[PDB]
CSV table of C-alpha atoms and ligand atoms in Angstrom, one decimal:
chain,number,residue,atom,x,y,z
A,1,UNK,CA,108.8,89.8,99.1
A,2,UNK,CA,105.0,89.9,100.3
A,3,UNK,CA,105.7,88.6,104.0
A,4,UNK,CA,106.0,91.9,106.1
A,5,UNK,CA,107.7,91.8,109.5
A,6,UNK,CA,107.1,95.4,111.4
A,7,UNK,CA,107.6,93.4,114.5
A,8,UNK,CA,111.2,92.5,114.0
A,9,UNK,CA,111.7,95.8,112.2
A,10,UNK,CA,110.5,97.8,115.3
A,11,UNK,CA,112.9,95.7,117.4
A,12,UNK,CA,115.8,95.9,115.1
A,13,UNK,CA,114.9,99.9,114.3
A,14,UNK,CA,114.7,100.6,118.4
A,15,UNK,CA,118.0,98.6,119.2
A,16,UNK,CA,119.9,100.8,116.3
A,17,UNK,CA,118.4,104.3,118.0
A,18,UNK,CA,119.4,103.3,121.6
A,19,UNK,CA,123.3,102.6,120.8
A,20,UNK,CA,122.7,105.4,118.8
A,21,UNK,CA,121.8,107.8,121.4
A,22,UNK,CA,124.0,106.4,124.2
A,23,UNK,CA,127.3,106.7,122.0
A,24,UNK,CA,125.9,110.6,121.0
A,25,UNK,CA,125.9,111.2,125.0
A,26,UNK,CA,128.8,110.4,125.5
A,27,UNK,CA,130.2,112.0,122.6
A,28,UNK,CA,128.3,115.4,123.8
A,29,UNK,CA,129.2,115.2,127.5
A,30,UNK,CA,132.7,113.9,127.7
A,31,UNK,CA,135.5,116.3,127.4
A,32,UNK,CA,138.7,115.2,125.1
A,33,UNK,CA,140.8,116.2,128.2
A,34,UNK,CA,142.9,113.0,129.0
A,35,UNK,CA,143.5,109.4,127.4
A,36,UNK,CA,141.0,107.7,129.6
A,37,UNK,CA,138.2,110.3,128.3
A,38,UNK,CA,139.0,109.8,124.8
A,39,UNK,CA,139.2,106.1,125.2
A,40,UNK,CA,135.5,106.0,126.2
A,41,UNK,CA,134.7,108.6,122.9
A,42,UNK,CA,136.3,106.2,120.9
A,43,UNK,CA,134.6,103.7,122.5
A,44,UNK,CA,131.3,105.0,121.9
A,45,UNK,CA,132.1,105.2,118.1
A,46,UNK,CA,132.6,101.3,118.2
A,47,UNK,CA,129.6,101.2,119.7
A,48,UNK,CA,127.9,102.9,117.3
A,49,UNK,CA,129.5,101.5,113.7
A,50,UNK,CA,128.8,98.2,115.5
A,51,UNK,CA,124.6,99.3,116.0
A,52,UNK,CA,125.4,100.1,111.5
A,53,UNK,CA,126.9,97.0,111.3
A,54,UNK,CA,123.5,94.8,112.9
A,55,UNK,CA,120.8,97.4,111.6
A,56,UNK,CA,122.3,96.8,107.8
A,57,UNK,CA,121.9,93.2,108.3
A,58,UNK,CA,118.4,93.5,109.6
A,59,UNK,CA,116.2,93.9,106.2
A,60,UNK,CA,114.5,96.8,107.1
A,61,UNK,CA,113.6,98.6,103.9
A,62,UNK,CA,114.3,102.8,103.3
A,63,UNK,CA,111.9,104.5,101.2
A,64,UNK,CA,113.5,106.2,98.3
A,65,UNK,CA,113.9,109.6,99.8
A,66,UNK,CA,115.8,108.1,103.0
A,67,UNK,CA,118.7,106.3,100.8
A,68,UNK,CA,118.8,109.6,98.9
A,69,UNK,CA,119.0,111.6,102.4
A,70,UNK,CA,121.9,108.2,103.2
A,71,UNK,CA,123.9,108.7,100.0
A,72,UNK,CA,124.2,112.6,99.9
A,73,UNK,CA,124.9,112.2,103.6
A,74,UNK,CA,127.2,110.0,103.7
A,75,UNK,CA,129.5,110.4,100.1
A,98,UNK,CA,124.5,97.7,101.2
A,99,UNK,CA,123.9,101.6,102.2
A,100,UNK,CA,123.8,100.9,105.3
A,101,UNK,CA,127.4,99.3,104.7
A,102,UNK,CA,128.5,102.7,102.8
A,103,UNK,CA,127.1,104.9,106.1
A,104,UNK,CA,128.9,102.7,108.2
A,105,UNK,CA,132.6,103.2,106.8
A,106,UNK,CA,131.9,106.5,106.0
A,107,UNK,CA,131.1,107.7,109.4
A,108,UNK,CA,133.9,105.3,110.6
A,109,UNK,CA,136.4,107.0,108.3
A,110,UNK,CA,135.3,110.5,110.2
A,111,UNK,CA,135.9,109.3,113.4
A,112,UNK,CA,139.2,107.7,113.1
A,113,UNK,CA,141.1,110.2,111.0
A,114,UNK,CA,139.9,113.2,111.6
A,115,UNK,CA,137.3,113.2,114.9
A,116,UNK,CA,140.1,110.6,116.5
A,117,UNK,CA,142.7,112.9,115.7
A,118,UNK,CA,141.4,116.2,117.1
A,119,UNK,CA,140.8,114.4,120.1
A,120,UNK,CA,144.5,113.8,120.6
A,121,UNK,CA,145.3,117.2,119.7
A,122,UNK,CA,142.8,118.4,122.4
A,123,UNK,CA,144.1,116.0,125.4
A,124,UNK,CA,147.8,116.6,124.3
A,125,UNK,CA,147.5,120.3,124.4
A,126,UNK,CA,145.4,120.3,127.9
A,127,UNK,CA,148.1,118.4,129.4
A,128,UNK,CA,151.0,121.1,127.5
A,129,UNK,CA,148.9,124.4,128.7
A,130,UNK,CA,148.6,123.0,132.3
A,131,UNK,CA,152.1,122.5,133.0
A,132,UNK,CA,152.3,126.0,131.6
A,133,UNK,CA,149.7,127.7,134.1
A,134,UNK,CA,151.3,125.8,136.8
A,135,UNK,CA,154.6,128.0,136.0
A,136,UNK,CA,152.7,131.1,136.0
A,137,UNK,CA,151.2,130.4,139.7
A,138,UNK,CA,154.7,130.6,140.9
A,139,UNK,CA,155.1,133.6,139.7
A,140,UNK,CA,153.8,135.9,142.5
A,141,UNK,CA,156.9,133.7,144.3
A,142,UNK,CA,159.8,135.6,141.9
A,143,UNK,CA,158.3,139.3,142.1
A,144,UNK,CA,159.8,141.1,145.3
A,145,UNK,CA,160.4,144.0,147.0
A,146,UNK,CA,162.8,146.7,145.2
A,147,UNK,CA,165.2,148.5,147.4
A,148,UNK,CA,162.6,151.4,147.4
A,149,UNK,CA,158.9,151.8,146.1
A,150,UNK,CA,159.8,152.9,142.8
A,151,UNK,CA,161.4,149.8,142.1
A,152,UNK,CA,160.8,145.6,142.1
A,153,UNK,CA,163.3,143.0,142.1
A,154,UNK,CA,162.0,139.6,139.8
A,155,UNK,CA,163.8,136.7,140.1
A,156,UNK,CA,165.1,136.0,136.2
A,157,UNK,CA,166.9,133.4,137.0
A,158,UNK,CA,163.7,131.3,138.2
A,159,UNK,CA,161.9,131.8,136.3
A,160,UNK,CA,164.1,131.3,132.9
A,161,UNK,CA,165.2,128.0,134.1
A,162,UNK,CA,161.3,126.6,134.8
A,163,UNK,CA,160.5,128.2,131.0
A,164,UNK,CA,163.5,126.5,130.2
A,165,UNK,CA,162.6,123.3,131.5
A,166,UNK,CA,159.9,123.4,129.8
A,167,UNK,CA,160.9,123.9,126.6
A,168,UNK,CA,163.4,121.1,127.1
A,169,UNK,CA,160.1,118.5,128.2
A,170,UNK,CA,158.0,119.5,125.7
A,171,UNK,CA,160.8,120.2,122.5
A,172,UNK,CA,161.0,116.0,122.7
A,173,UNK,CA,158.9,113.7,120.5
A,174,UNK,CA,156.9,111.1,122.3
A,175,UNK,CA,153.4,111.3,123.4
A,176,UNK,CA,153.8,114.2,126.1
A,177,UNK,CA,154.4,116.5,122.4
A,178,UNK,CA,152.7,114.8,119.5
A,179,UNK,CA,149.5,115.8,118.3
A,180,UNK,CA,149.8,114.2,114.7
A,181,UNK,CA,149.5,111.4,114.7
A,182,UNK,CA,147.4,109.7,117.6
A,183,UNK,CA,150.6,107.7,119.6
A,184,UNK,CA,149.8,104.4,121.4
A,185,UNK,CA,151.9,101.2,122.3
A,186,UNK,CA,155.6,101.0,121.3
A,187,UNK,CA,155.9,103.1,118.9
A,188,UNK,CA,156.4,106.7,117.2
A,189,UNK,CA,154.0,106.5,115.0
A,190,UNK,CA,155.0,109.2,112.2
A,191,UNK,CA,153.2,110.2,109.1
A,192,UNK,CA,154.5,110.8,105.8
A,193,UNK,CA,155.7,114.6,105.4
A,194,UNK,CA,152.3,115.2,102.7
A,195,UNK,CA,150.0,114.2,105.7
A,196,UNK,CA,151.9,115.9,108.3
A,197,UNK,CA,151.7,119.3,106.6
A,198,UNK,CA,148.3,119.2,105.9
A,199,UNK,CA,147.5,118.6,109.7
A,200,UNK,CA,149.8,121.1,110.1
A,201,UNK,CA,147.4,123.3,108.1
A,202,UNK,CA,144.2,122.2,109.7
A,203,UNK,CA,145.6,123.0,112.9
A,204,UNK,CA,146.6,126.5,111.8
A,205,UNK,CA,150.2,126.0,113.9
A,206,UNK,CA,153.8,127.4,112.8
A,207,UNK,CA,156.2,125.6,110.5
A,208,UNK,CA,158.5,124.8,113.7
A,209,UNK,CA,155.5,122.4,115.1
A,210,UNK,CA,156.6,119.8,112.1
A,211,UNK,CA,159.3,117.4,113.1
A,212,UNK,CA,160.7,115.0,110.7
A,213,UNK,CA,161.2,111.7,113.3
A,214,UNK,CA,162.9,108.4,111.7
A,215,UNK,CA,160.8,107.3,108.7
A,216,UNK,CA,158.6,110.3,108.3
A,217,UNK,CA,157.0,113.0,110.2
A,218,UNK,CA,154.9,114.6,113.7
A,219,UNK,CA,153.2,117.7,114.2
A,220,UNK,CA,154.2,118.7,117.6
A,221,UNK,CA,153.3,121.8,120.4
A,222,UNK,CA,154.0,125.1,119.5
A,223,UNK,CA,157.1,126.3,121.8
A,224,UNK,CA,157.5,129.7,119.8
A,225,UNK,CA,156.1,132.0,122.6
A,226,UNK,CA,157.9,130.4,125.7
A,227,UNK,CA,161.0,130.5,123.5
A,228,UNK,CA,160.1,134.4,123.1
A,229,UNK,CA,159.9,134.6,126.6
A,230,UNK,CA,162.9,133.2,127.9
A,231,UNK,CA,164.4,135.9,125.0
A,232,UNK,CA,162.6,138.8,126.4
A,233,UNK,CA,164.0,138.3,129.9
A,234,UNK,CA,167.3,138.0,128.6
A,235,UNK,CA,166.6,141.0,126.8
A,236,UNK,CA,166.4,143.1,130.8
A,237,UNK,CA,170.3,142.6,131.4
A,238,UNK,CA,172.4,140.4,133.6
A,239,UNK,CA,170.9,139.6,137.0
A,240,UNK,CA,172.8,140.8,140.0
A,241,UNK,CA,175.0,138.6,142.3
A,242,UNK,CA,171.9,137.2,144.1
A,243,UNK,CA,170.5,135.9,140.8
A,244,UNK,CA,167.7,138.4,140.4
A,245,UNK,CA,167.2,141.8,138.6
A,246,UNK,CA,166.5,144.9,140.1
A,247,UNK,CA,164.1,147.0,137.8
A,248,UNK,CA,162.3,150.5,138.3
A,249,UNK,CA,158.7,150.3,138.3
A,250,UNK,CA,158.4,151.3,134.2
A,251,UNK,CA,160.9,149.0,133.2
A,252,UNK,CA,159.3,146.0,135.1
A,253,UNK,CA,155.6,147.0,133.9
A,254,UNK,CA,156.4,147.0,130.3
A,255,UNK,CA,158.3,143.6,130.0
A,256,UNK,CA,155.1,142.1,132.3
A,257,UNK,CA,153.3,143.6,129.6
A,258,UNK,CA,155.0,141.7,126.6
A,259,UNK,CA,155.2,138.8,128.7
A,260,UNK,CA,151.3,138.5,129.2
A,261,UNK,CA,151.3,139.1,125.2
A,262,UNK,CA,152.8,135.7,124.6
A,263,UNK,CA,150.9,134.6,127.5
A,264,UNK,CA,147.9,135.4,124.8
A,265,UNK,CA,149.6,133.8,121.9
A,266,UNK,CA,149.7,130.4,124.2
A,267,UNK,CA,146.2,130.9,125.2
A,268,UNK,CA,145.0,132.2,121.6
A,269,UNK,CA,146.4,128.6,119.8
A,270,UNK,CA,144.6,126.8,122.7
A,271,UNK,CA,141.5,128.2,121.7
A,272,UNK,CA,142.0,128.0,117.7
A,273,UNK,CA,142.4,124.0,119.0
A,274,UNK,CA,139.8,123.7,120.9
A,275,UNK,CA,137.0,125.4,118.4
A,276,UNK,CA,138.3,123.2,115.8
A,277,UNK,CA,137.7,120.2,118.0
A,278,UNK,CA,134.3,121.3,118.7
A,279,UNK,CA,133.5,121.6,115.3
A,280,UNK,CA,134.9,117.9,114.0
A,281,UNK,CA,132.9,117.1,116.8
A,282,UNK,CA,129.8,119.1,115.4
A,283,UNK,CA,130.6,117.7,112.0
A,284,UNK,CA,130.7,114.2,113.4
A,285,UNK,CA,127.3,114.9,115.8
A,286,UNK,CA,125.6,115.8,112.3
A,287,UNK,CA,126.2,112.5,110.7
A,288,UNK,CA,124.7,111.1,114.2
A,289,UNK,CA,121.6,113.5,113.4
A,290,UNK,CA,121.1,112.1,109.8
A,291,UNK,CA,121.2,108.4,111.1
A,292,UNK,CA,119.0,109.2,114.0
A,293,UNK,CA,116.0,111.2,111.8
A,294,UNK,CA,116.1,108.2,109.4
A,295,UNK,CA,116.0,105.4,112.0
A,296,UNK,CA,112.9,107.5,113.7
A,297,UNK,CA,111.3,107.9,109.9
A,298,UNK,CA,111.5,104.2,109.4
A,299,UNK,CA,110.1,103.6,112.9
A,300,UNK,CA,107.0,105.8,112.0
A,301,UNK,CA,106.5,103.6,108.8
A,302,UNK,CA,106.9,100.6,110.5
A,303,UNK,CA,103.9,101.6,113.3
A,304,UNK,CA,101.6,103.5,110.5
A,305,UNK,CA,98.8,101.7,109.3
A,306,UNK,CA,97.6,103.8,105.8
A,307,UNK,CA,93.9,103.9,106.0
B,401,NI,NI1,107.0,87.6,99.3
């Protein structure tokens, strides 16, 4: 217990710091915006349970204050830390990632709908009137209702899908996602054996409503509507436009801040890996 070793502890210290750092990177610069994005994020959390995983097998010794910072932390240290942070990243990091790429995917085909708008607004039969094409633009909303009302990995957010499967949750862990995620009672789905938390569909479903609400189209399939008429249901319509966009954002701050959460834990491990470097370089006088 008298042989010190600051050589191999500076090697094994150093090696934890760098696959420390590299997985935070990636963590900080890649966007939850696709599968192939998150793959690499969960990648990087491999990577770094793994760098746990060597340094607790290393020997190096924590003072007394840097266990105390590990335990409170994180609530055979090293060990604890490791599943702990692990626990994070799967179940709750992993799963806001999903929810993030799922819902990018969801709001795009949505803005894609609204470019072809401009399309479906014409010329009224004078200039105190417009003629929209209803019809159009009912049956794209429509369509996508239909796409995205299905359960399979276009819709789920809870849980993570992959392989084969549905993977469903039980009802208890589906509502309290459901919760966290601060969506409408319509997003959970029971599917076979349990249960999803899906997109929300409620303010396309109030659109396709509100247009049905202006009256029957004409012969050609398209409404003529005076200029007040026309300007107040655009007006509603860019109000669930809001909602969408308003959810998206609820989403996406969330994400940021399991991400945050997550980054903090990386903090904690990085100050006491660069504390135990400075001890293991300090020569007390
Ligand atoms: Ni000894």
């Amino acid at each position: 217990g008298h042989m010190e070793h600051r050589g191999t502890d500076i090697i094994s210290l150093s090696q934890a710091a760098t696959k420390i750092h590299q997985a935070q990177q990636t963590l900080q610069s890649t966007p939850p915006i696709s599968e192939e994005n998150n793959d690499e994020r969960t990648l990087a959390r491999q990577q770094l349970t793994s760098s746990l995983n060597a340094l607790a097998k290393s020997g190096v010794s924590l003072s007394a204050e840097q266990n105390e910072n590990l335990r409170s932390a994180f609530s055979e240290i090293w060990d604890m830390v490791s599943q702990n942070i692990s626990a994070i990243g799967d179940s709750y990091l992993g799963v806001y990632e999903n929810v993030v790429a799922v819902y990018t995917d969801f709001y795009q085909a949505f803005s894609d709908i609204l470019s072809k708008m401009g399309g479906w607004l014409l010329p009224g039969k004078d200039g105190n009137t417009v003629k929209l094409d209803v019809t159009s633009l009912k049956n794209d909303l429509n369509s996508l209702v239909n796409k995205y009302n299905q359960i399979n990995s276009n819709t789920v957010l809870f849980p993570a899908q992959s392989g084969s499967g549905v993977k469903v949750a039980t009802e208890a862990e589906a509502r309290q996602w459901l919760s966290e995620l601060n969506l409408p009672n319509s997003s959970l789905k029971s599917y076979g054996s349990g249960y999803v938390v899906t997109v929300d569909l409620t303010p396309l479903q109030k659109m396709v409503q509100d247009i049905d609400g202006l009256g029957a189209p004409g012969k050609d399939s398209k409404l003529e509507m005076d200029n007040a008429k026309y300007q107040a249901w655009q007006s509603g319509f860019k109000a669930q436009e809001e909602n969408m966009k308003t959810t998206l954002q609820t989403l996406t701050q969330k994400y940021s801040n399991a991400n945050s959460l997550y980054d903090n834990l990386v903090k904690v491990l990085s100050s006491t890996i660069s504390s135990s470097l400075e001890t293991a370089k300090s020569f007390l006088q």
